[PDB]
């Protein structure tokens, strides 16, 4: 009697995979003040379970109105739990892959990187740029696919750049220095230096600097959300989550991650 799951599903091997997928968003001042930050998250499940399994998902945070999650929406299969009703939900899942819930958090976010900019005018013909990035997570974890984008003014005539890790180039048509790093461990720093030559191009006003933007991926959930339990029970087939191959992953990525310069 379940609209989203047929009867008779059978798998040789019962498996349940869960990905906590998060985008961390930040606006930060040149001096490191958090002006705004939030996480937008979703939980994607891949269910290869026989029969009509009854599943219970509990987290460390209150996800049903231990920080609270500002807002949360749930797949149609999700029901409120009679017990631990603020941190957990219950459901018979659809078969295969589906999105179990989406959410937003704003408090106690782990900011994986700090960008520290230095953009000093030298006369009217030159900008000296140094940007330091600091990774703020466990040293045994690696961020990957890191990109830093540093804007240049429209009167830019030339750029010289040297990065200490990864690779960088000036994309003149985009007025940006693009700095890419394949991997970086936690509690590290790296930096890039550039000299930007400017045309006189007087008769204009001051340069309204876009922020420095970052992209990255991190192997954790910046919200701090943690799965406390993932229960499965099928009384007719008589198996439970300890007969199921389970896998819980936490995957973080930048959303809009911007630092004023």
Author numbering: 158 to 222, 240 to 435
What does the paper say about this structure?
Proper operation of the pivotal CME cargo adaptor AP2 requires membrane-localized Fer/Cip4 homology domain-only proteins (FCHO). The AP2 complex, composed of α, β2, μ2, and σ2 subunits, is pivotal to mammalian CCV formation, and its deletion is embryonically lethal in mice. FCHO1 and FCHO2 are similar in overall domain arrangement —folded N-terminal acidic phospholipid-binding homodimerization F-BAR domains and C-terminal folded μ-homology domains (μHD) separated by a ~300-residue, low-complexity intrinsically disordered protein linker, which has been suggested to participate in AP2 activation, although how it does so is undetermined. We dissect the network of interactions between the FCHO interdomain linker and AP2, which concentrates, orients, tethers, and partially destabilizes closed AP2 at the plasma membrane.
To confirm the identity of the extra, Cμ2-proximal electron density as the N terminus of FCHO2 linker, chimeras of Cμ2 alone with N1+N2 attached to the C terminus via 30-residue unstructured synthetic glycine-, serine-, and alanine-rich flexible linkers were then created, crystallized, and their structures solved at resolutions varying from 2.0 to 2.6 Å by MR using an unliganded version of Cμ2 as a search model. Crystals of a complex of Cμ2 and a peptide corresponding to this WxxL signal were grown, diffracted to 1.7-Å resolution, and were solved by MR using 1.9-Å unliganded Cμ2 as a search model.
